[PDB]
Design an enzyme around this catalytic site. Structure first.
Site, PDB file in Angstrom:
ATOM      1  N   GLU A   1     -26.200  13.398   0.839  1.00  0.00           N
ATOM      2  CA  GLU A   1     -27.458  14.136   1.228  1.00  0.00           C
ATOM      3  C   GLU A   1     -28.614  12.863   0.669  1.00  0.00           C
TER       4      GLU A   1
ATOM      5  N   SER B   1      -9.243  -5.723 -13.628  1.00  0.00           N
ATOM      6  CA  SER B   1      -9.693  -6.094 -12.069  1.00  0.00           C
ATOM      7  C   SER B   1      -9.146  -3.932 -11.257  1.00  0.00           C
ATOM      8  N   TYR B   2      -9.614  -4.267  -9.966  1.00  0.00           N
ATOM      9  CA  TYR B   2     -10.304  -2.181 -10.063  1.00  0.00           C
ATOM     10  C   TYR B   2      -8.176  -2.007  -9.672  1.00  0.00           C
TER      11      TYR B   2
ATOM     12  N   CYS C   1      -2.072   1.681  -2.809  1.00  0.00           N
ATOM     13  CA  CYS C   1      -3.148   2.640  -2.975  1.00  0.00           C
ATOM     14  C   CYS C   1      -2.612   4.228  -2.184  1.00  0.00           C
TER      15      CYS C   1
ATOM     16  N   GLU D   1      -7.921   1.902 -12.090  1.00  0.00           N
ATOM     17  CA  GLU D   1      -7.341   2.832 -11.444  1.00  0.00           C
ATOM     18  C   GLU D   1      -6.512   3.140 -12.395  1.00  0.00           C
TER      19      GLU D   1
ATOM     20  N   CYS E   1       0.726  -1.490   0.004  1.00  0.00           N
ATOM     21  CA  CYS E   1      -0.513   0.305  -0.251  1.00  0.00           C
ATOM     22  C   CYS E   1       0.690   1.451  -0.411  1.00  0.00           C
TER      23      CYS E   1
ATOM     24  N   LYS F   1      -1.248   5.243  -5.882  1.00  0.00           N
ATOM     25  CA  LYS F   1      -2.073   5.216  -6.716  1.00  0.00           C
ATOM     26  C   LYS F   1      -2.451   6.446  -6.708  1.00  0.00           C
TER      27      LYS F   1
ATOM     28  N   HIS G   1     -26.888  19.810   3.244  1.00  0.00           N
ATOM     29  CA  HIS G   1     -26.512  19.987   1.939  1.00  0.00           C
ATOM     30  C   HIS G   1     -26.711  21.485   1.653  1.00  0.00           C
TER      31      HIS G   1
HETATM   32  C1  LIG Z   1      -1.873  -1.292  -6.846  1.00  0.00           C
HETATM   33  C2  LIG Z   1      -2.802  -1.554  -5.493  1.00  0.00           C
HETATM   34  C3  LIG Z   1      -4.205  -0.802  -4.402  1.00  0.00           C
HETATM   35  C4  LIG Z   1      -3.905  -0.552  -3.789  1.00  0.00           C
HETATM   36  N1  LIG Z   1      -5.475   0.332  -3.919  1.00  0.00           N
HETATM   37  C5  LIG Z   1      -5.691  -0.169  -1.925  1.00  0.00           C
HETATM   38  C6  LIG Z   1      -6.223   1.048  -1.486  1.00  0.00           C
HETATM   39  O1  LIG Z   1      -6.657   1.595  -2.289  1.00  0.00           O
HETATM   40  N2  LIG Z   1      -7.003   1.224  -0.489  1.00  0.00           N
HETATM   41  C7  LIG Z   1      -6.855  -0.531   0.425  1.00  0.00           C
HETATM   42  O2  LIG Z   1      -7.626  -0.557   1.932  1.00  0.00           O
HETATM   43  N3  LIG Z   1      -6.120  -1.840  -0.663  1.00  0.00           N
HETATM   44  C8  LIG Z   1      -5.338  -0.871  -1.258  1.00  0.00           C
HETATM   45  N4  LIG Z   1      -4.357  -2.408  -2.075  1.00  0.00           N
HETATM   46  C9  LIG Z   1      -4.221  -3.784  -0.888  1.00  0.00           C
HETATM   47  C10 LIG Z   1      -3.371  -3.093   0.008  1.00  0.00           C
HETATM   48  O3  LIG Z   1      -2.237  -2.972  -1.275  1.00  0.00           O
HETATM   49  C11 LIG Z   1      -2.720  -4.719   0.499  1.00  0.00           C
HETATM   50  O4  LIG Z   1      -4.045  -4.691   1.177  1.00  0.00           O
HETATM   51  C12 LIG Z   1      -2.341  -4.010   1.905  1.00  0.00           C
HETATM   52  O5  LIG Z   1      -1.534  -3.626   1.692  1.00  0.00           O
HETATM   53  C13 LIG Z   1      -1.851  -5.533   2.322  1.00  0.00           C
HETATM   54  O6  LIG Z   1      -1.254  -5.575   3.478  1.00  0.00           O
HETATM   55  P1  LIG Z   1       0.309  -7.286   4.055  1.00  0.00           P
HETATM   56  O7  LIG Z   1       0.530  -6.307   5.018  1.00  0.00           O
HETATM   57  O8  LIG Z   1      -0.996  -8.026   3.719  1.00  0.00           O
HETATM   58  O9  LIG Z   1       1.138  -7.572   3.061  1.00  0.00           O
HETATM   59  P2  LIG Z   1       1.821  -6.178   2.245  1.00  0.00           P
HETATM   60  O10 LIG Z   1       1.661  -4.406   2.337  1.00  0.00           O
HETATM   61  O11 LIG Z   1       2.261  -6.656   0.545  1.00  0.00           O
HETATM   62  O12 LIG Z   1       3.512  -6.128   3.012  1.00  0.00           O
HETATM   63  C14 LIG Z   1       4.052  -7.362   2.999  1.00  0.00           C
HETATM   64  C15 LIG Z   1       5.531  -7.454   3.103  1.00  0.00           C
HETATM   65  O13 LIG Z   1       6.350  -8.511   3.238  1.00  0.00           O
HETATM   66  C16 LIG Z   1       7.468  -8.292   2.107  1.00  0.00           C
HETATM   67  N5  LIG Z   1       7.702  -9.563   2.562  1.00  0.00           N
HETATM   68  C17 LIG Z   1       7.386 -11.164   1.619  1.00  0.00           C
HETATM   69  N6  LIG Z   1       7.796 -11.836   1.990  1.00  0.00           N
HETATM   70  C18 LIG Z   1       9.053 -11.640   2.995  1.00  0.00           C
HETATM   71  C19 LIG Z   1      10.211 -12.599   3.819  1.00  0.00           C
HETATM   72  N7  LIG Z   1       9.757 -13.395   3.642  1.00  0.00           N
HETATM   73  N8  LIG Z   1      10.372 -11.667   4.553  1.00  0.00           N
HETATM   74  C20 LIG Z   1      10.354 -10.744   4.395  1.00  0.00           C
HETATM   75  N9  LIG Z   1       9.246  -9.938   3.974  1.00  0.00           N
HETATM   76  C21 LIG Z   1       8.392 -10.687   3.584  1.00  0.00           C
HETATM   77  C22 LIG Z   1       7.309  -7.994   1.480  1.00  0.00           C
HETATM   78  O14 LIG Z   1       7.510  -7.984   0.486  1.00  0.00           O
HETATM   79  C23 LIG Z   1       5.739  -6.999   1.286  1.00  0.00           C
HETATM   80  O15 LIG Z   1       6.946  -5.754   2.219  1.00  0.00           O
HETATM   81  C24 LIG Z   1      -3.965  -1.906  -3.244  1.00  0.00           C
HETATM   82  C25 LIG Z   1      -3.234  -2.544  -3.896  1.00  0.00           C
HETATM   83  C26 LIG Z   1      -2.638  -2.428  -5.048  1.00  0.00           C
HETATM   84  C27 LIG Z   1      -1.626  -3.541  -5.752  1.00  0.00           C
HETATM   85  C1  LIG Z   2     -26.088  33.274   2.718  1.00  0.00           C
HETATM   86  C2  LIG Z   2     -26.769  31.434   3.178  1.00  0.00           C
HETATM   87  C3  LIG Z   2     -26.811  30.425   3.688  1.00  0.00           C
HETATM   88  C4  LIG Z   2     -27.097  29.673   3.569  1.00  0.00           C
HETATM   89  N1  LIG Z   2     -26.096  27.680   3.310  1.00  0.00           N
HETATM   90  C5  LIG Z   2     -26.872  26.787   4.001  1.00  0.00           C
HETATM   91  C6  LIG Z   2     -26.180  25.387   3.150  1.00  0.00           C
HETATM   92  O1  LIG Z   2     -25.152  25.657   3.257  1.00  0.00           O
HETATM   93  N2  LIG Z   2     -27.402  24.511   3.393  1.00  0.00           N
HETATM   94  C7  LIG Z   2     -28.346  24.716   4.755  1.00  0.00           C
HETATM   95  O2  LIG Z   2     -29.260  23.367   5.236  1.00  0.00           O
HETATM   96  N3  LIG Z   2     -28.830  25.854   5.063  1.00  0.00           N
HETATM   97  C8  LIG Z   2     -28.201  26.858   4.186  1.00  0.00           C
HETATM   98  N4  LIG Z   2     -29.225  28.358   4.748  1.00  0.00           N
HETATM   99  C9  LIG Z   2     -30.081  28.462   5.332  1.00  0.00           C
HETATM  100  C10 LIG Z   2     -31.505  27.918   4.188  1.00  0.00           C
HETATM  101  O3  LIG Z   2     -30.951  28.854   3.077  1.00  0.00           O
HETATM  102  C11 LIG Z   2     -32.772  28.046   5.023  1.00  0.00           C
HETATM  103  O4  LIG Z   2     -33.129  27.024   6.186  1.00  0.00           O
HETATM  104  C12 LIG Z   2     -33.512  27.974   3.857  1.00  0.00           C
HETATM  105  O5  LIG Z   2     -34.036  28.835   2.749  1.00  0.00           O
HETATM  106  C13 LIG Z   2     -35.229  27.754   5.015  1.00  0.00           C
HETATM  107  O6  LIG Z   2     -36.393  27.738   3.831  1.00  0.00           O
HETATM  108  P1  LIG Z   2     -37.880  28.417   3.590  1.00  0.00           P
HETATM  109  O7  LIG Z   2     -38.866  27.823   3.655  1.00  0.00           O
HETATM  110  O8  LIG Z   2     -37.938  28.405   5.927  1.00  0.00           O
HETATM  111  O9  LIG Z   2     -37.701  29.782   4.128  1.00  0.00           O
HETATM  112  P2  LIG Z   2     -36.814  30.234   2.502  1.00  0.00           P
HETATM  113  O10 LIG Z   2     -36.504  29.572   1.632  1.00  0.00           O
HETATM  114  O11 LIG Z   2     -35.754  31.903   3.038  1.00  0.00           O
HETATM  115  O12 LIG Z   2     -38.143  31.077   1.583  1.00  0.00           O
HETATM  116  C14 LIG Z   2     -39.673  31.598   1.921  1.00  0.00           C
HETATM  117  C15 LIG Z   2     -39.881  32.101   0.875  1.00  0.00           C
HETATM  118  O13 LIG Z   2     -41.164  33.311   1.218  1.00  0.00           O
HETATM  119  C16 LIG Z   2     -41.137  34.151   0.178  1.00  0.00           C
HETATM  120  N5  LIG Z   2     -41.762  35.033   1.256  1.00  0.00           N
HETATM  121  C17 LIG Z   2     -41.422  36.263   2.239  1.00  0.00           C
HETATM  122  N6  LIG Z   2     -42.912  36.293   2.836  1.00  0.00           N
HETATM  123  C18 LIG Z   2     -43.682  35.935   1.897  1.00  0.00           C
HETATM  124  C19 LIG Z   2     -45.627  36.767   1.693  1.00  0.00           C
HETATM  125  N7  LIG Z   2     -45.961  37.420   2.326  1.00  0.00           N
HETATM  126  N8  LIG Z   2     -45.881  36.523   0.678  1.00  0.00           N
HETATM  127  C20 LIG Z   2     -44.954  35.103   0.136  1.00  0.00           C
HETATM  128  N9  LIG Z   2     -44.032  34.990  -0.050  1.00  0.00           N
HETATM  129  C21 LIG Z   2     -43.555  35.455   1.211  1.00  0.00           C
HETATM  130  C22 LIG Z   2     -40.131  34.566   0.914  1.00  0.00           C
HETATM  131  O14 LIG Z   2     -39.544  35.536   0.345  1.00  0.00           O
HETATM  132  C23 LIG Z   2     -38.764  33.227   0.117  1.00  0.00           C
HETATM  133  O15 LIG Z   2     -38.771  33.058  -1.758  1.00  0.00           O
HETATM  134  C24 LIG Z   2     -28.544  29.279   3.734  1.00  0.00           C
HETATM  135  C25 LIG Z   2     -29.078  30.882   4.921  1.00  0.00           C
HETATM  136  C26 LIG Z   2     -28.279  31.178   3.676  1.00  0.00           C
HETATM  137  C27 LIG Z   2     -28.818  33.232   3.989  1.00  0.00           C
END
Ligand SMILES: Cc1cc2nc3c(=O)[nH]c(=O)nc-3n(C[C@H](O)[C@H](O)[C@H](O)COP(=O)(O)OP(=O)(O)OC[C@H]3O[C@@H](n4cnc5c(N)ncnc54)[C@H](O)[C@@H]3O)c2cc1C
Ligand SMILES: Cc1cc2nc3c(=O)[nH]c(=O)nc-3n(C[C@H](O)[C@H](O)[C@H](O)COP(=O)(O)OP(=O)(O)OC[C@H]3O[C@@H](n4cnc5c(N)ncnc54)[C@H](O)[C@@H]3O)c2cc1C
Ligand SMILES: OCCN1CCN(CCO)CC1
Ligand SMILES: OCCN1CCN(CCO)CC1
Lengths: 588, 588
Positions: free
Chosen positions: A571, A290-291, A154, A295, A149, A157, A566
């Protein structure tokens, strides 16, 4: 059961103290041991529900029922007065170092599992040696401590995946108002490799420091288990010696397979070579589905390369096939060519690799399709990604008695024990287990605690989440849809699904109705979530948290009652309502 | 309780069919209604555990105990023969359209909650009107259908955040091997705004189409509740009329507050103006310390702007203050200036905005620090982000009897009912609830189902996850550390924490030990996870899945037994071990 646990714990711990959190004599001993720099496990009986039974049961080992009680390698050493006597007479160091063996633990293999196991064991006073040796690839590639890895898996990669993702970031930036001339932007492979390799080098070095700082002996030597407690080691100089260990952990991992066709070993490469390749691959053929194959093809294409994947039958065998097809469809739509229903027959060399100027060679690949047409095309690089395999007959003599399955993997109990009772196996060589780095780490750390700190917790290998880091990432936890249907029957399975579009893709003019998610649920079990699947950006971040909920037995109702964050991709899992059986389209 | 549920369900549903999944007469009626394009709710008694009791209880409304039974607006209409009689005599349409009121449901407010409520209600045959009116800002800014999140909130905010994140993507790309000259790369504000506004326009239009396609009446008119069932509407032409509705949903949201200082309304802007601003803000002062303030400051600085935030006391009051400080520290280290312990006294105009060439004006901001020193600095744009407030005295006459709290928000039961029994309130104006778009949507959809489809499920407002989309994002679910300690006492709280570094930051040479996560746990309740907190990239994707597990009562042991996905940021939640009480450093 207390008796069986205590006897196993005493027999196996290197240095262990039975204690109570509120005993001054227990603290006297702990301060002595800390002052003497003696590492040990500690079991606070007043934190165990059966501690009073444990306390009485200890008299079968020590003839006493009080705390503290110190043990070394299965021998009762003393109460507080005895331990202090040893200390004041300068006898304690000798006592805690006496062993029938050179080490309490020998780990064969310094990769994800073995390093995790060795480091954890040493925390409890286990005198530990970690052996690691990297057999060079056919072209001579080798690397440092840390395993597959860290060096060739990993870590590199995903860094090259990130280099590829940054291509789409450059494309997107213009739509979001950034003024840049893409027509002058190109990618430099060797600059990327140098950065990746600098990071890997820092990991190699960090592991060596970590082992030193934990008093673990690191031997850059090939280990061979010749009897249950004897490991023959061969060093860089071909010097052969034998070291002995009480517990042995086999953690030797796998290496890439080659197909048996002319030219494959001579002229192709594998992932082992790719991640340090000193020349740019150029026009590339990936043989495999394979993966790893997908990848590697994926990031090479996003870096601007001319990439083809040769597929014998299907993509990602063993994975949900609906998701696998969507993964491959995205790739094909984004620059990856697929030679489908095709196998290779021969690799022939047209140019040798340029070692001086760091340019690839050139290869002619001959193959054939199932319809009888011939495949014949030139490539600068051919990568085989056709599976991985253990190589244990190099590592254990047949006479030791460690049972392997027909794939050469080690047959283990649910606590990683082999058929040789002091020998354990973890990671990729443990038959039947998911072959992933965090699995190997949890297995090794938890095993070390059972061996040397009296723990009982086993590693849970069920519903282990994964992510395939293809150009559009695929995260999954649990059963594929087809496996669920096979296990429970179609009438007991409900699948909720939806397409979605990341908000980040809107201004960037990327695809509607390509990202996709589904929950595969069991109707007769309260709509239990059996499998979760998501195709989209940051799919590993999306998936991870749900794996906790699935571990806890989440149902569809648990997803529904949870409120979305959101705006996120994730979500959409909290508002799924279209079922497959309804026939309603999942598009949005 | 069955009787109370059935009586409420019958009284409230617009059109509802009591059915059994396996009754041909029930299917006869469903096919008639589908053919006549009559939308309705359906309750399949053979899918309810108390359906047989429900079936008997129906005789108190219909004098019969069989299925099917059709009701309209609280009146039993007939069994299958009667419904078919109405159909064959062309009387059914008139029957299902008869009502004391113009509409079954009037939604006042076409935002996150109101659109979700109106669309869901119409699915069950509720004749629905959605009113939306956007009162212009002081400089005249207005926008289309969809509410705050769509037009001036979560949607444009996160798109501009993404524009900002793409800056760091351009920086990173070089380290990953891409050859680009940053010294010629600049950002064009108006190009970004045009893209954001094009997307918003597609949402405005999509909502109008959605309402049309669901037979919802959309009135671009200001609604005022003058009696429990009468809504006075004023249209664009100032024409005043009255429409009547059975159920009323107040979903009118909030608008930005201004401080009462000279020049604030005349020369400053708010988030309502920012997201369509036709000129680049230029050198900007954000007055405020809310998530809006910090989000806006953050993306403006990452787009290259000269940005200052004026902070009266603390950042993100109400949020975990350890996390808030880390959020602000990151911003300060990445280009955002902070005027701390400072308040504004006066905004004076130095240049008027250039409407022809789309350039900002210029302002002099005078203020003072707590130590008595004066603040006096020029800015091209001043953004007030000092809170938001409802404005209901414009929307309900005091005589109607809808109780407000001292902040002007509506006091609701746990099923969103106001003190006027046919009037409900959802979203930001519902006192005490988290002010988030997915909350408003779940509240409105679930309410509509209770009103018109006999559902019982309430919205669960506890442990609602959030994400602050600052330059380094902050996700959270559950209690802050300080709130947990206040509620349960310090001795009952354990906090597990760690720094981490995204793999993507390694080759890019970004910071060690800045991303950070923690789990705030309750010792006496099996180490229950009370609060989850993460500072890092993609924090909303990280957090979302854990919110399901927290909803299910996850403990620390549930996190531990789950296996990580590698390499991700999120996996670090599965291996936390350092406690705050231990004093061990969280750095890695
Ligand atoms: C291209 C690739 C991408 C991967 N990507 C991911 C990922 O993204 N996420 C994930 O979870 N897993 C990933 N894996 C799997 C992960 O690499 C293995 O699951 C993990 O390394 C296994 O750990 P291990 O301890 O069993 O063996 P290893 O990490 O292979 O270590 C074994 C060690 O023992 C050495 N050895 C062997 N025989 C002897 C010996 N007689 N004496 C002394 N040393 C020895 C070996 O040379 C090696 O250094 C990937 C694998 C590959 C090939
Ligand atoms: C800058 C900013 C960033 C935000 N970022 C996030 C975020 O990332 N994630 C998240 O979950 N929440 C976020 N929020 C909160 C989210 O916007 C509010 O929780 C959500 O819009 C509330 O929904 P609501 O239906 O209560 O009111 P609103 O979405 O405010 O809708 C109420 C509507 O009724 C209208 N209205 C008011 N009075 C009347 C009336 N008498 N007659 C007719 N229409 C009327 C209003 O003009 C409006 O159009 C953010 C808020 C702000 C200001
Ligand atoms: O290599 C085959 C692995 N395979 C893919 C992951 N699967 C779990 C997620 O669905 C299980 C097995
Ligand atoms: O505006 C204050 C909101 N506040 C922040 C979120 N909190 C929950 C996460 O810790 C609760 C309340």
């Amino acid at each position: 059961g207390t008796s069986q646990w205590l006897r196993k714990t005493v027999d196996s711990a290197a240095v262990i103290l039975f204690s109570k959190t509120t005993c001054p004599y227990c603290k006297k001993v702990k301060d002595v041991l800390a002052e003497a720099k003696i590492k040990h496990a500690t079991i606070e009986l007043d934190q165990l529900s059966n501690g009073s039974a444990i306390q009485k049961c200890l008299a079968s080992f020590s003839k006493i029922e009080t705390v503290p009680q110190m043990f070394v390698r299965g021998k009762f050493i003393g109460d507080s007065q005895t331990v202090l006597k040893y200390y004041s007479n300068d006898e304690l160091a000798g006592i805690v170092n006496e062993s029938k063996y050179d080490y309490d633990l020998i780990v064969i293999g310094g990769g994800s599992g073995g390093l995790a196991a060795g480091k954890e064991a040493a925390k409890y006073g286990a005198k530990t040696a970690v052996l690691d040796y990297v057999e060079p690839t056919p072209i001579g590639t080798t690397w440092g401590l840390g395993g597959t890895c860290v060096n060739v898996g990993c870590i590199p990669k995903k860094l090259m995946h990130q280099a590829g993702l940054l291509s789409h970031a450059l494309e997107d930036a213009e739509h979001f108002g950034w003024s840049l001339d893409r027509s002058k932007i190109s990618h430099n492979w060797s600059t990327m490799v140098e950065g990746v390799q600098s990071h890997i080098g820092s990991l190699n070095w960090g592991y060596k420091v970590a082992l030193r700082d934990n008093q673990v002996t690191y031997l850059n030597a090939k280990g061979r288990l010749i009897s249950p407690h004897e490991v023959q080691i061969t060093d860089k100089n071909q010097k052969v010696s034998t070291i002995t260990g009480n517990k042995i952990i086999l953690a030797t991992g796998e290496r890439p397979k080659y197909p048996e066709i002319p030219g494959a070993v001579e002229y192709g490469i594998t992932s082992d070579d790719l991640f340090s390749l000193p020349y740019f691959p150029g026009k590339t053929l990936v043989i495999g589905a394979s993966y790893v194959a997908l990848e590697c093809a994926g990031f090479l294409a996003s870096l601007g390369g001319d990439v083809t994947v040769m597929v014998r039958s299907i993509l990602l065998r063993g994975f949900d096939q609906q998701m696998a097809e969507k993964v491959g469809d995205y790739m094909e739509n984004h620059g990856v060519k697929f030679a489908k229903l095709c196998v290779p027959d021969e690799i022939k060399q047209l140019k040798v690799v340029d070692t001086e100027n760091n340019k690839p060679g050139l290869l002619l690949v001959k193959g054939h399709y199932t319809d009888g047409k011939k495949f014949e095309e030139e490539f600068e690089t051919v990568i085989f990604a056709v599976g991985r395999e253990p190589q244990l007959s190099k590592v254990l003599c047949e006479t030791v008695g460690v049972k392997l399955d027909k794939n050469g993997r080690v047959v283990c109990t649910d606590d990683e024990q082999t058929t040789v009772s002091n020998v354990y196996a973890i990671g990729d060589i443990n038959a039947g287990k998911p072959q992933l780095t965090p699995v190997a780490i949890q297995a090794g750390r938890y095993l070390a605690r059972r061996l040397f700190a009296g723990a009982t917790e086993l590693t849970d290998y069920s519903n282990v989440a994964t992510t395939v880091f293809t150009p559009l990432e695929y995260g999954a936890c649990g059963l594929s849809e087809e496996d669920a249907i096979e296990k429970y029957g179609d009438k007991d399975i409900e699948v909720y699904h939806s397409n979605f579009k990341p908000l980040e893709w809107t201004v960037a003019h990327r695809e509607d109705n390509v990202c996709y998610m589904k929950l595969v649920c069991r109707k007769s079990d309260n709509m239990r979530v059996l499998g979760l699947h998501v195709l989209g950006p940051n799919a590993g971040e999306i998936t991870q948290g749900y794996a906790v909920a699935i571990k806890m037995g989440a149902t569809k109702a648990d997803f529904d009652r949870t409120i979305g964050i959101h705006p996120t991709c994730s979500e959409t899992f909290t508002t799924l309502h279209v079922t497959k059986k309804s026939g309603v389209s999942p598009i949005v």
